[PDB]
């Protein structure tokens with residue numbers, strides 16, 4: 266149900282957010298696909314914390330396509346799996362443009378948020 270998904274996301278937020286000096290409005294906006302254009306590293310590294318928590322960012326700091334697909338199939342309602350997978354496919358190479366894995370995580374999520382703002386949700 267959406268409550269199971271939302272509660273899951275809140276859990277990840279609560280584990281990651283305290284470790285970073287994020288601005289409250291900026292953190293809140295991510296849940297509804299509102300991604301600041303050029304935020305400070307606190308918000309970007311929060312996004313990495315979340316990716317690592319979802320187990321989709323490796324130790325080496327790459328975002329795994331297969332692991333993100335699997336998370337999509339497990340966590341999303343059947344009516345949302347298709348756009349999420351299309352978003353992932355559209356944004357799969359965003360990470361190759363950034364050396365810093367906080368940028369990799371943040372701008373890959375931002376890519377997905379820009380691509381499908383009506384559906385994307387971030388912890």
Ligand SMILES: c1ccc2[nH]ccc2c1
Pocket residue numbers: 312313315316319321328333369370371373374
């Ligand atoms: C940021 C970027 C890519 C991601 N895949 C799963 C979580 C996540 C967060």
